[PDB]
Write an enzyme that holds these catalytic residues in place. Structure first.
Site, PDB file in Angstrom:
ATOM      1  N   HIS A 181      35.608  46.943  20.057  1.00  0.00           N
ATOM      2  CA  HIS A 181      34.255  47.497  19.988  1.00  0.00           C
ATOM      3  C   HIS A 181      34.257  48.988  20.306  1.00  0.00           C
ATOM      4  CE1 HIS A 181      29.864  45.888  20.235  1.00  0.00           C
ATOM      5  NE2 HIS A 181      29.997  46.884  19.382  1.00  0.00           N
ATOM      6  N   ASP A 220      25.707  41.757  21.567  1.00  0.00           N
ATOM      7  CA  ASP A 220      27.007  41.490  22.154  1.00  0.00           C
ATOM      8  C   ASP A 220      26.838  40.552  23.342  1.00  0.00           C
ATOM      9  OD1 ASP A 220      29.566  41.943  23.555  1.00  0.00           O
ATOM     10  OD2 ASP A 220      29.703  43.799  22.412  1.00  0.00           O
ATOM     11  N   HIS A 228      28.634  41.038  25.803  1.00  0.00           N
ATOM     12  CA  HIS A 228      28.874  42.023  26.854  1.00  0.00           C
ATOM     13  C   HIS A 228      27.985  43.245  26.664  1.00  0.00           C
ATOM     14  CE1 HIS A 228      32.592  39.704  26.174  1.00  0.00           C
ATOM     15  NE2 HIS A 228      32.659  39.692  27.495  1.00  0.00           N
ATOM     16  N   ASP A 230      29.139  46.402  27.471  1.00  0.00           N
ATOM     17  CA  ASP A 230      30.047  47.509  27.177  1.00  0.00           C
ATOM     18  C   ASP A 230      29.517  48.801  27.803  1.00  0.00           C
ATOM     19  OD1 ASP A 230      31.793  45.868  25.712  1.00  0.00           O
ATOM     20  OD2 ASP A 230      30.735  46.223  23.825  1.00  0.00           O
ATOM     21  N   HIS A 258      37.467  49.488  25.615  1.00  0.00           N
ATOM     22  CA  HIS A 258      36.629  48.675  24.739  1.00  0.00           C
ATOM     23  C   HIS A 258      35.512  47.963  25.491  1.00  0.00           C
ATOM     24  CE1 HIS A 258      38.903  45.121  26.028  1.00  0.00           C
ATOM     25  NE2 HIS A 258      40.019  45.611  25.519  1.00  0.00           N
ATOM     26  N   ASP A 304      28.773  42.369  17.713  1.00  0.00           N
ATOM     27  CA  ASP A 304      30.036  41.883  18.246  1.00  0.00           C
ATOM     28  C   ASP A 304      30.071  40.382  17.972  1.00  0.00           C
ATOM     29  OD1 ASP A 304      32.016  40.668  19.938  1.00  0.00           O
ATOM     30  OD2 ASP A 304      32.023  42.484  21.178  1.00  0.00           O
ATOM     31  N   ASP A 329      31.497  38.031  19.413  1.00  0.00           N
ATOM     32  CA  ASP A 329      31.411  37.210  20.615  1.00  0.00           C
ATOM     33  C   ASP A 329      29.986  36.886  21.077  1.00  0.00           C
ATOM     34  OD1 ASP A 329      30.364  39.365  22.023  1.00  0.00           O
ATOM     35  OD2 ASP A 329      32.216  39.845  23.076  1.00  0.00           O
ATOM     36  N   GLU A 368      35.167  42.903  16.613  1.00  0.00           N
ATOM     37  CA  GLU A 368      35.810  41.903  17.453  1.00  0.00           C
ATOM     38  C   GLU A 368      36.230  40.576  16.816  1.00  0.00           C
ATOM     39  OE1 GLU A 368      36.372  41.997  21.148  1.00  0.00           O
ATOM     40  OE2 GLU A 368      36.310  44.179  20.928  1.00  0.00           O
TER      41      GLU A 368
END
Lengths: 282, 282, 282, 282, 282, 282
Positions: E88, E110, E112, E114, E127, E209, E211, E254
């Protein structure tokens, strides 16, 4: 009170898909025994003779659907028929037969619309044209035998894959369509209510294609399509339709044991059939 | 602030199911370490001695549940107990023990009601009778030790599988039941609110059976049942109960490593336990 | 005629691996019932108390192995012991205990040699040092309790993974080693014969690590290593050793339910144990 | 030059196993097309009518096997028949029918011996008695129709699971048996040679049960048994028998799509059939 | 009308994760062909040169992101860019480049946030810092090149995993965050509306992303996190953003083929991209 | 002592197969690090630029193979090259380049012979013609650049799938071929010896196609073919060739991450490469 089960081990098209094994898989998931546990007196009528394969097989498909239509048309009134299958093409025969000449509503729960004609179909597969044929559109050899419903009395639920020509035909026939977009917006309960309302006062024939279920949850289907109904959603749909007290017949098609995981897809459809027939947790 | 963990590696019934391995699997998913990361000072009390097997094992089940009840009854007040397990039969001991003689509310999150008695049970399994025994119904040898709650203070959530006699017993004891039908209608948030309201003013004991989760998502359970709660749903439920500030004890049972996929079911229950204890994304 | 089964639910090392669940999984594969079906009168002695974890745990490992050694040393002569486990570290206790002070041959069927010492081990794990400790090499705290065999009476079979220092120690102690290279060259039958010959006239203790089997076939092991024995190969090995009539004890270790697929690895070891005890197809 | 294919979708016994779907799965693996690619002119005769189920079904099994026997007995000489199936019970009919009254050798490649009688069978399943019935042992209702071979002309290969009474019956009838023990000792090439020699000068009927293959490699079988032949081994066996130029008929049974993984087991049997019919890499 | 596709096969961090294979997997899912089927004229610009590996690789990551930023900044206005990727970290370059110096809104979907900096990151992985760097926080070497957005113009959706320092940085920068808690409370439709409102009047850059999707449904991702969005949910989100008519660029990152199951995760992101670009069932 | 690694992310043919991701997957299996652990000083030369796709791509394939050939021809003598890949088409370039104008022996370990020409190929795929092109047969555009070996110096091992025309071309060029039939008869050790003898006195280039391994064991390959070498077999083959001390170069091709299971196929080829380079258990 009375239910009749008949299978149509049909897998006729450009290539085999393995759905002819659907009826055995469904019977394997104990559909009959569970219908009895529910309180119904059940009789398995066996299978409709179907030619196998080594606009393909139109006549053979037509021939099997005809035997099926005649068979269901002959059942005493008061008998609820459940047609197990492979190819959704069989519904040309089940709907036309179970309708017994009356005006009936069709609740088609499928990832596909099956509203293609020889002119709009990219593959030429008849199993992608049954609902259109039932509505009076398509090959003369098929509509002359199976045309049984008015597009105004047809409701499609869960559709997520359509061919360009299909879209045109559905719009011009004015078929009510609830795609996954509508399910994501309204929820299945409101859509179920709108289905019953749109087809109010009519006996109901439910045609359930296994592929309407998300393939992550139900992998054993003829033509898998990502992002479908969850198992609880399909259930709620069946429950609400059951509550109407107007469902008169049911198709459980496109089960594909080859892609299935321990017959779980066949078991889910059996479970869905029980809900449609009034099975409740309590 | 203080949490105590105790396991009951019990797998006693007509046949083994493999749930005696649940406690190790749960500890393997780092339940303790994560509880510490959360801010709790934790002590693992180890396991309750349990006889294994090669109305079966009623006395052995009774004996283990008794040791468990006595153990939890002895914990200082202010200590939050978490009983890890296999057989849900252990809750006869955890609920009776963690209640410490007070009136407590029981939130039973299970695919089953566990409300059978020797008279209504088709299998004779005691692990299908714990909640009924806790409510004062069933074998004298069990109710004399574990009867700890009034059926009016019991709320069942996520139930999707019931035995005929169970239904009768639940209706006549008047136990509040939220089956998957209610979850599909109200959503878990409203049901969670109704749970807290139905049991308002009471300390809360949550008994979480791994099988309440959909087996597609959480395969490692003693008795899998199709179409359960999603992981986010079970989470939201725990969060809302956590917000009440009234949860005083918890059971994490029926984990079955044999059917699990990389301990993911044990990890989900650990995650659920953290939410119940106040873990939030932020 | 008499067999005793004891488990050592041990998973002590740098990190957990899940092998403490090995004994339950093995019992789950019906080891006892099948030993009875074979004609043996069997008694399950239960499990050796083992500390769990949240040169790590050397004393705790030493303590459990000591209880195990003492337990097996006390069994009447004529009793064939089968130690079920997790960590191969237990063999320090099983071999030293089942040997009962006599000179016995050790047939170690493992993907690893377990011949490391505190000086050669890259990880510091005691479960990678049991055979060396049994041979008199390693930490004083371990050799003072478990040194029970002369390296000349040790035969390793199926090894496919070695640490640099391990190789040195094995060469200088002169331990007979049949790696997968030798299996690919001679076949297991000739290697089995050479094993019996190399250790002729001695009672035999077989230590079977689940990881000797190819992980594609037996995934549920503590430390999987690609390219091991097939199931038929391990079988033939056990059969030939059984024919010698000299096998006096057996270890079934490193079963890891977390990575297993429906307990098939535990079932394979149970099957291997039956062959070692004389089970034949006819 | 001429080959006839007929299926027997039979799954009759104490409980269903799903093998009635074997014929469709096999046809799905393109058995016919590949036989043509090989140079044979092929005709699919379809399926033998078989009753389904909801000493069980002895008469229904007997009835289907009878229709099968009569069907194969009527084929012109020079026609090589291939019977596809589910239950191995069908071989009572295929062997008796394809033998056409002559003395023929039977090469039964199965994990089981199928040599039980009503007196030795622990389950009462007829699909575990076909070879015994063919040899003249068992229920009068079956031997009166299917007794077609002398036990001296029967060779069993790959057996790894036997019932106590079965062992007695095989020894007293003096049936040549090559269990997995013999395969692990001699290799399939020498066993194949001994098979041809033991039955020298005789036309050969090969009855191939899918379960002879290791279930790790071929999961889709009626009754899986661990540790069987590899795919290359079964192949070599078929090749050597093919070289004799004496094989006159073949059964491909017990395929179970429900447990299969993408029809790979059905594909393996089709591959095995091609080798038996002379397909070589070059 | 015009779309440009560029890949960044980057997998730079403490250890490899396999996401450098994301672009090929995405192209494999026919992203380009389907964009054309949609009506767009597409040109694949190929891949950005990226160093591989055998605060790690900060300069190499910085170097690749710089080439990417310059590349996108040079595209004619009216060209919609789609950056395919692995790490990412690339978004530092895609957002800064596709923004072309204007004020743009960032919709970061995402699991996450980030939003780490060298000071709050437990792993030191760049990342896990791209969005913070884009907001002007972090290493001077990165912010001097990629700072392109004001935290007030950033909306995070689907977050379910945060580091302690991350939470502080997000609160103090005042970044709008919709974690899975908010998704479980409001639904994605209302959150999507609030996203558009919170960033009203701004061109929109969507950074997706893989994920964010539940790993049970989409396993092939760099860093899997349990309990994410369903496929239909992510879809609805894209549809509503598409309706705004304000989306100007997109990142699909990702994807991790190593953990994927038949490229289904890459296919889902391609599907999500189509919805973002206006693909509807009808 | 010196090894050079270069990848060719090529997936050019009638349709993509996903093998362009092979080099990354192989590097992911730590080929370089393990070669260093072995004692070699290694340098990764990166990847050869390859056109991707959205007699197909003959010129693009020719162009990439040319860059590869030139690259390897330029390496100092004494440098052992390892070409990682996707399409086996690359070997036209690796063999012609690594040969450096000398006479070298080619040991092609593949499930296929890759000996087709534009005239015998049913698909027109160039990746099914590399060995024929290397032998001087096929399209002028390819033989003019890559013809580097005499068919008398070529040995094929593990072949199990051939096209009709291929068989003719191999017989008339007189190429030594060891199909799975020969492996099942002689064993890999004797075949390995015959390989070395048939090509005695020559430097050896080993071209290893991942598909030679049984797809049950190694699923991640471009074109899977049932019933191949086991992992131990391929190993023994590499070991014996390594012992000759004559191997001078190696290709590791056709790895397909999309079909792989946790990169295990890439790991197996890396393992095979180590054995070819002298890695032994001891």
């Amino acid at each position: 009170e009375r239910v009749a089960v008949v299978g149509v081990p049909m897998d006729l098209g450009a290539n085999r898909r393995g759905v002819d094994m659907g009826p055995s898989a469904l019977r394997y998931a104990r559909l009959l025994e569970q219908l009895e546990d529910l309180g119904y007196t059940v009789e398995d009528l066996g299978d409709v003779p179907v030619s196998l394969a080594r606009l393909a097989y139109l006549e053979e498909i037509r021939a099997a659907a005809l035997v099926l239509k005649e068979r269901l048309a002959a059942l005493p009134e008061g008998v609820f028929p459940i047609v197990l299958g492979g190819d959704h093409s069989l519904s040309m025969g089940s709907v036309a037969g179970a309708a017994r000449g009356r005006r009936v509503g069709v609740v088609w729960v499928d990832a596909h619309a099956d509203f293609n004609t020889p002119e709009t179909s990219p593959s030429g597969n008849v199993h992608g044209m049954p609902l259109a044929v039932l509505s009076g559109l398509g090959h003369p050899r098929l509509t002359e035998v199976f045309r049984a419903v008015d597009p105004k009395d047809v409701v499609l639920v869960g559709v997520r894959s359509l061919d360009p020509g299909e879209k045109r035909l559905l719009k011009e026939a004015g078929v009510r369509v609830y795609t996954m977009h509508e399910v994501d917006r309204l929820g299945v309960a409101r859509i179920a209510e709108e289905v019953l309302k749109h087809l109010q006062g009519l006996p109901l024939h439910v045609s359930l294609d296994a592929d309407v279920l998300d393939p992550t949850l139900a992998p054993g289907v003829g033509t898998p399509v990502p992002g479908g109904l969850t198992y609880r959603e399909a259930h709620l749909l069946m429950e609400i339709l059951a509550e109407s007290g107007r469902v008169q017949s049911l198709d459980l098609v496109e089960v594909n044991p080859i892609l299935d995981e321990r017959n779980r897809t066949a078991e889910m459809l059996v479970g869905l059939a029980l809900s449609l027939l009034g099975k409740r947790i309590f």
